[PDB]
Amino acid sequence: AGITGTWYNQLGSTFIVTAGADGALTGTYESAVGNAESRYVLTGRYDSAPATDGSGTALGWTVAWKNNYRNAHSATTWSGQYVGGAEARINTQWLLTSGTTEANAWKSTLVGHDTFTKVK
Amino acid sequence: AGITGTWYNQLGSTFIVTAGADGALTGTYESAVGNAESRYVLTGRYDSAPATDGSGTALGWTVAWKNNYRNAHSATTWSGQYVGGAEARINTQWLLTSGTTEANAWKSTLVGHDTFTKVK
Amino acid sequence: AGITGTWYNQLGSTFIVTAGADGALTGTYESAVGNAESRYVLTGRYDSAPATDGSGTALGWTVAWKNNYRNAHSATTWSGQYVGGAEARINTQWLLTSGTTEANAWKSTLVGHDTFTKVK
Amino acid sequence: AGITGTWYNQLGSTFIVTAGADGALTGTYESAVGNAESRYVLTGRYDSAPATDGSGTALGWTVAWKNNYRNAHSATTWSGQYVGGAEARINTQWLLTSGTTEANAWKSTLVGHDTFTKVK
Ligand SMILES: O=C(O)CCCC[C@@H]1SC[C@@H]2NC(=O)N[C@@H]21
Ligand SMILES: O=C(O)CCCC[C@@H]1SC[C@@H]2NC(=O)N[C@@H]21
Ligand SMILES: O=C(O)CCCC[C@@H]1SC[C@@H]2NC(=O)N[C@@H]21
Ligand SMILES: O=C(O)CCCC[C@@H]1SC[C@@H]2NC(=O)N[C@@H]21
């Protein structure tokens, strides 16, 4: 209900997610940036029984950057929380890992942050 | 074949995963540490068509820290790569996000690293 | 000139810095949040000869959370870049490490992000 | 006494540091890897009054990747803890930020981990 829907980051990337009663996140991620083109499968987990003291709902998901058209040989994971209300928000930090040789493995993992809203 | 199996981190946590032909990771995570007890659902993605130049296979997965017995109101995401061979390895960095109030949201996200092997 | 001055994060924390000709950052950090009170020493480094292609100036600094009044037994490091102009900005990610036992060392390091401006 | 000395990471990089009575870290970093050559200035902070319950000493430092010979237009920060004894150790996580355009700013920050020992 809260987490199910279409979400938009600050850089124009679309996250279309379903929050299953079990705790499953399934969907598609469309990335406006990077070595990516078009639509990618998303899987993840959320807290299906969150705290009743105004705290956010912990969640996370993974996109492997491989569809029928492109393969970036990389995966992003987002770790975050859903903050429900009028101005509904998913505040995340992410890790992007690239497939490297053991000599390049030190420089394999980019870190960042994304804020997602339900407003295009 | 490579990624499918039972994996062990440096702190004694068990990761039992199946790597589906589509790019799906499904399994269970048993955590030896933290505010956790017993067995938790794992979902993730991997690069189902990796590079043929000695590079690792990018992957990622999520555990929401909620089963039938416990709820820690938190989720970990691991971002990493599978390095195949005799001494097969998953080198990861992780983000653990806790469900917080907006006043506590600065301190919501722990970062770390795990190395997983197929040797108990 | 650019980096020298008083800076304000999104959570109301004051960063007063001098950018030395050698590449030295020296100053004080006043933290509006956490287990902190009042004014703490800052040391860091910046790129004293940045690129002339509209790119930001790489920098970083450390605060150990210990003055004459408090000791939180912790240190934050910020890694970022100075973006000069009319709306001058320091975009950072940070690591906060706490002094722990080896059993608690997995949960020692919080990660986040701060944006600093010259507007109070 | 504990933190003052020559330190070696897992990838063969030398950290030569002095731990001042005030809490100041000063030194040189010699990087065995990356777009770097030779010797770079290090500044940082440590907890000069740590806890007497077997807990590590929180510290941090910054290297801007610029000397008289090279400029990588980047800075690394390490956040960590000193674990004293027979097998003395500095366990860190790091952020490497590169000077980028605002279009490339999402991919500006690499994350990793280093363990330093006093054994070459
Ligand atoms: O460049 C790549 O290796 C593949 C595309 C990565 C897209 C990045 S992942 C973090 C951030 N979130 C997005 O909306 N896309 C970028
Ligand atoms: O303490 C909690 O909030 C829930 C348990 C967290 C387990 C952590 S997640 C990162 C690391 N990997 C493990 O094997 N377990 C710990
Ligand atoms: O709570 C502590 O352990 C000490 C105070 C930490 C202050 C944090 S560090 C990251 C963020 N930046 C700030 O302005 N202060 C908080
Ligand atoms: O490649 C660059 O941009 C400059 C050199 C970076 C060296 C990296 S920083 C993290 C790690 N620690 C080291 O010993 N060196 C590498």
Short mmCIF file of N, CA and C in Angstrom, two decimals, chain C residues 41 43-51 53-56 58-64 66 71 73-75 77-81 83 93-102 105 108-109, chain D residues 41 43-51 53-56 58-64 66 71 73-75 77-81 83 93-102 105 108-109:
data_model
loop_
_atom_site.label_atom_id
_atom_site.label_comp_id
_atom_site.label_asym_id
_atom_site.label_seq_id
_atom_site.Cartn_x
_atom_site.Cartn_y
_atom_site.Cartn_z
N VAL C 41 38.32 20.14 17.07
CA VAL C 41 39.40 20.39 16.05
C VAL C 41 39.10 19.49 14.77
N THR C 43 41.10 18.61 11.06
CA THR C 43 42.27 18.64 10.10
C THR C 43 41.90 17.83 8.84
N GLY C 44 42.46 18.29 7.75
CA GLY C 44 42.26 17.70 6.45
C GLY C 44 43.18 18.12 5.34
N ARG C 45 42.92 17.62 4.17
CA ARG C 45 43.69 17.90 2.90
C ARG C 45 42.70 18.25 1.81
N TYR C 46 43.14 19.10 0.90
CA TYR C 46 42.42 19.37 -0.39
C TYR C 46 43.45 19.38 -1.57
N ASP C 47 42.86 19.24 -2.78
CA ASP C 47 43.58 19.39 -4.06
C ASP C 47 43.89 20.91 -4.21
N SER C 48 45.14 21.30 -3.92
CA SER C 48 45.60 22.73 -4.07
C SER C 48 45.77 23.15 -5.58
N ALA C 49 45.79 22.26 -6.61
CA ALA C 49 45.88 22.55 -8.08
C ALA C 49 44.78 21.76 -8.84
N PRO C 50 43.45 22.11 -8.69
CA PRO C 50 42.35 21.40 -9.38
C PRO C 50 42.32 21.64 -10.92
N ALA C 51 41.55 20.75 -11.59
CA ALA C 51 41.36 20.73 -13.07
C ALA C 51 40.57 21.97 -13.55
N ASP C 53 38.41 22.31 -16.25
CA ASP C 53 37.35 21.74 -17.15
C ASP C 53 35.95 21.68 -16.45
N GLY C 54 35.61 22.68 -15.62
CA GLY C 54 34.43 22.72 -14.73
C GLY C 54 34.29 21.59 -13.70
N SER C 55 35.35 20.88 -13.29
CA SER C 55 35.35 19.80 -12.25
C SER C 55 35.52 20.38 -10.83
N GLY C 56 34.91 19.73 -9.83
CA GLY C 56 35.09 20.08 -8.40
C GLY C 56 36.51 19.80 -7.87
N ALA C 58 38.67 18.08 -5.06
CA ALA C 58 38.58 16.96 -4.08
C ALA C 58 39.16 17.46 -2.74
N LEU C 59 38.47 17.09 -1.68
CA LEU C 59 38.95 17.33 -0.28
C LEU C 59 38.44 16.26 0.68
N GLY C 60 39.01 16.36 1.86
CA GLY C 60 38.62 15.54 3.02
C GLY C 60 39.07 16.05 4.35
N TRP C 61 38.36 15.72 5.40
CA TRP C 61 38.78 16.05 6.79
C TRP C 61 38.27 15.09 7.82
N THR C 62 38.93 15.19 8.98
CA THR C 62 38.67 14.33 10.15
C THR C 62 38.36 15.21 11.38
N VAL C 63 37.36 14.81 12.13
CA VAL C 63 37.10 15.30 13.53
C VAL C 63 37.17 14.07 14.45
N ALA C 64 38.03 14.07 15.43
CA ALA C 64 37.97 13.10 16.59
C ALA C 64 37.00 13.78 17.59
N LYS C 66 36.30 14.55 20.69
CA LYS C 66 37.01 14.76 21.99
C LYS C 66 37.47 16.23 22.05
N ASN C 71 34.09 13.49 25.52
CA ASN C 71 34.78 12.48 24.66
C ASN C 71 33.75 11.38 24.28
N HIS C 73 34.56 8.93 22.20
CA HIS C 73 35.40 7.74 21.80
C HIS C 73 35.12 7.28 20.36
N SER C 74 35.08 8.29 19.48
CA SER C 74 34.71 8.18 18.05
C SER C 74 35.38 9.25 17.19
N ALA C 75 35.42 8.97 15.88
CA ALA C 75 35.94 9.92 14.85
C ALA C 75 35.07 9.84 13.61
N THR C 77 35.20 10.94 9.50
CA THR C 77 35.89 11.44 8.30
C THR C 77 34.88 11.83 7.22
N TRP C 78 35.03 12.96 6.58
CA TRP C 78 34.23 13.42 5.41
C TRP C 78 35.15 13.34 4.20
N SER C 79 34.69 12.74 3.09
CA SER C 79 35.32 12.72 1.75
C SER C 79 34.39 13.37 0.77
N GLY C 80 34.87 14.34 0.01
CA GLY C 80 33.99 15.12 -0.86
C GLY C 80 34.59 15.95 -1.89
N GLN C 81 33.77 16.87 -2.41
CA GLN C 81 34.30 17.91 -3.39
C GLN C 81 33.62 19.29 -3.18
N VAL C 83 32.36 22.52 -5.00
CA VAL C 83 31.74 23.00 -6.29
C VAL C 83 31.61 24.53 -6.08
N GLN C 93 30.35 12.57 1.44
CA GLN C 93 29.98 11.34 2.19
C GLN C 93 30.91 11.23 3.37
N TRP C 94 30.41 10.65 4.45
CA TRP C 94 31.19 10.47 5.71
C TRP C 94 31.09 9.04 6.29
N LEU C 95 32.09 8.67 7.05
CA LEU C 95 32.23 7.49 7.90
C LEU C 95 32.42 7.96 9.35
N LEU C 96 31.61 7.51 10.29
CA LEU C 96 31.75 7.75 11.75
C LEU C 96 32.14 6.40 12.32
N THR C 97 33.35 6.25 12.85
CA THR C 97 33.88 5.00 13.50
C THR C 97 33.84 5.25 15.02
N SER C 98 33.29 4.33 15.78
CA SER C 98 33.32 4.31 17.29
C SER C 98 34.35 3.30 17.71
N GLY C 99 35.06 3.60 18.82
CA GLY C 99 35.95 2.71 19.57
C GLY C 99 35.10 1.61 20.18
N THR C 100 35.29 0.39 19.71
CA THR C 100 34.59 -0.84 20.12
C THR C 100 35.52 -1.95 20.59
N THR C 101 34.92 -2.90 21.34
CA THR C 101 35.52 -4.29 21.46
C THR C 101 35.50 -5.02 20.09
N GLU C 102 36.42 -6.00 19.89
CA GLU C 102 36.51 -6.87 18.64
C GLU C 102 35.17 -7.66 18.35
N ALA C 105 32.98 -5.04 16.64
CA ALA C 105 33.72 -4.28 15.56
C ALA C 105 32.93 -4.24 14.23
N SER C 108 30.84 -0.98 14.20
CA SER C 108 31.68 0.17 14.63
C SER C 108 31.43 1.40 13.71
N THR C 109 30.98 1.27 12.43
CA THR C 109 31.14 2.34 11.37
C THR C 109 29.77 2.69 10.76
N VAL D 41 51.37 13.73 1.65
CA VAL D 41 51.10 14.23 3.05
C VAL D 41 49.73 13.60 3.55
N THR D 43 47.21 13.99 7.01
CA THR D 43 46.78 14.64 8.31
C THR D 43 45.49 13.93 8.80
N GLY D 44 45.39 13.89 10.10
CA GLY D 44 44.28 13.28 10.80
C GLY D 44 44.13 13.56 12.26
N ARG D 45 43.16 12.94 12.87
CA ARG D 45 42.82 13.04 14.33
C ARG D 45 42.66 11.64 14.89
N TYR D 46 43.00 11.51 16.16
CA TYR D 46 42.66 10.28 16.96
C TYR D 46 42.12 10.71 18.37
N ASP D 47 41.46 9.70 18.99
CA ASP D 47 41.00 9.79 20.39
C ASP D 47 42.27 9.72 21.29
N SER D 48 42.72 10.89 21.78
CA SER D 48 43.91 10.97 22.70
C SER D 48 43.59 10.42 24.14
N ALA D 49 42.34 10.17 24.60
CA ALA D 49 41.92 9.59 25.91
C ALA D 49 40.91 8.44 25.69
N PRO D 50 41.32 7.26 25.11
CA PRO D 50 40.41 6.12 24.86
C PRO D 50 39.93 5.41 26.17
N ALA D 51 38.86 4.60 25.98
CA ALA D 51 38.17 3.82 27.05
C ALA D 51 39.08 2.69 27.58
N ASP D 53 38.22 -0.41 28.88
CA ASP D 53 37.33 -1.63 28.88
C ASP D 53 37.63 -2.57 27.67
N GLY D 54 38.91 -2.71 27.27
CA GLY D 54 39.39 -3.41 26.05
C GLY D 54 38.85 -2.90 24.70
N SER D 55 38.37 -1.64 24.57
CA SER D 55 37.88 -1.02 23.30
C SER D 55 39.03 -0.38 22.50
N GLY D 56 38.93 -0.40 21.16
CA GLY D 56 39.88 0.29 20.26
C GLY D 56 39.83 1.83 20.36
N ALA D 58 39.51 5.24 18.42
CA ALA D 58 38.95 5.77 17.14
C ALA D 58 40.00 6.75 16.55
N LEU D 59 40.16 6.65 15.24
CA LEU D 59 41.00 7.60 14.46
C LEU D 59 40.49 7.75 13.03
N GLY D 60 41.10 8.73 12.40
CA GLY D 60 40.91 9.01 10.96
C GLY D 60 41.95 9.87 10.33
N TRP D 61 42.15 9.73 9.04
CA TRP D 61 43.06 10.63 8.28
C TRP D 61 42.69 10.78 6.83
N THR D 62 43.28 11.82 6.25
CA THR D 62 43.06 12.24 4.86
C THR D 62 44.40 12.31 4.11
N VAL D 63 44.41 11.80 2.90
CA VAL D 63 45.49 12.06 1.88
C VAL D 63 44.81 12.73 0.68
N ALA D 64 45.23 13.91 0.29
CA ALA D 64 44.90 14.51 -1.06
C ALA D 64 45.98 13.94 -2.00
N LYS D 66 48.09 14.46 -4.45
CA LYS D 66 48.84 15.60 -5.06
C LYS D 66 50.17 15.75 -4.29
N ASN D 71 49.40 14.69 -9.70
CA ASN D 71 48.08 15.14 -9.13
C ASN D 71 46.96 14.26 -9.75
N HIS D 73 43.81 14.56 -8.76
CA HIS D 73 42.54 15.37 -8.55
C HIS D 73 41.49 14.60 -7.74
N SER D 74 42.00 14.02 -6.64
CA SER D 74 41.26 13.11 -5.73
C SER D 74 41.80 13.16 -4.30
N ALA D 75 40.96 12.70 -3.37
CA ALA D 75 41.32 12.56 -1.92
C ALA D 75 40.72 11.28 -1.37
N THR D 77 39.84 9.50 2.39
CA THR D 77 39.72 9.52 3.86
C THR D 77 39.61 8.10 4.42
N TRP D 78 40.32 7.76 5.45
CA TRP D 78 40.22 6.48 6.21
C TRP D 78 39.58 6.81 7.55
N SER D 79 38.55 6.05 7.96
CA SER D 79 37.91 6.06 9.30
C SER D 79 38.07 4.70 9.92
N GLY D 80 38.57 4.64 11.14
CA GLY D 80 38.90 3.35 11.76
C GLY D 80 39.15 3.31 13.18
N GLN D 81 39.76 2.19 13.61
CA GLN D 81 40.24 2.07 15.05
C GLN D 81 41.58 1.30 15.15
N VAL D 83 43.66 -1.17 17.35
CA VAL D 83 43.53 -2.35 18.29
C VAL D 83 44.99 -2.66 18.70
N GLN D 93 37.77 1.53 7.23
CA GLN D 93 37.02 1.73 5.96
C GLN D 93 37.43 3.08 5.41
N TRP D 94 37.42 3.19 4.09
CA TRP D 94 37.81 4.43 3.37
C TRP D 94 36.80 4.85 2.28
N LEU D 95 36.78 6.12 1.98
CA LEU D 95 36.12 6.82 0.87
C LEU D 95 37.19 7.50 0.01
N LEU D 96 37.24 7.25 -1.29
CA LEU D 96 38.10 7.94 -2.27
C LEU D 96 37.15 8.77 -3.10
N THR D 97 37.22 10.09 -3.03
CA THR D 97 36.39 11.06 -3.83
C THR D 97 37.30 11.62 -4.94
N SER D 98 36.84 11.61 -6.17
CA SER D 98 37.50 12.27 -7.36
C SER D 98 36.76 13.54 -7.65
N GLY D 99 37.51 14.58 -8.07
CA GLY D 99 37.04 15.85 -8.63
C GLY D 99 36.35 15.55 -9.95
N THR D 100 35.05 15.75 -10.00
CA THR D 100 34.16 15.52 -11.16
C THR D 100 33.36 16.74 -11.56
N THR D 101 32.87 16.70 -12.82
CA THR D 101 31.67 17.53 -13.22
C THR D 101 30.40 17.08 -12.46
N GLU D 102 29.41 18.00 -12.29
CA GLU D 102 28.06 17.72 -11.63
C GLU D 102 27.27 16.55 -12.33
N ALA D 105 28.88 13.41 -10.88
CA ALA D 105 29.05 13.48 -9.38
C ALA D 105 28.50 12.21 -8.67
N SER D 108 31.45 9.74 -8.24
CA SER D 108 32.66 10.46 -7.72
C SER D 108 33.34 9.64 -6.60
N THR D 109 32.66 8.72 -5.84
CA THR D 109 33.13 8.23 -4.50
C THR D 109 33.20 6.69 -4.48
#
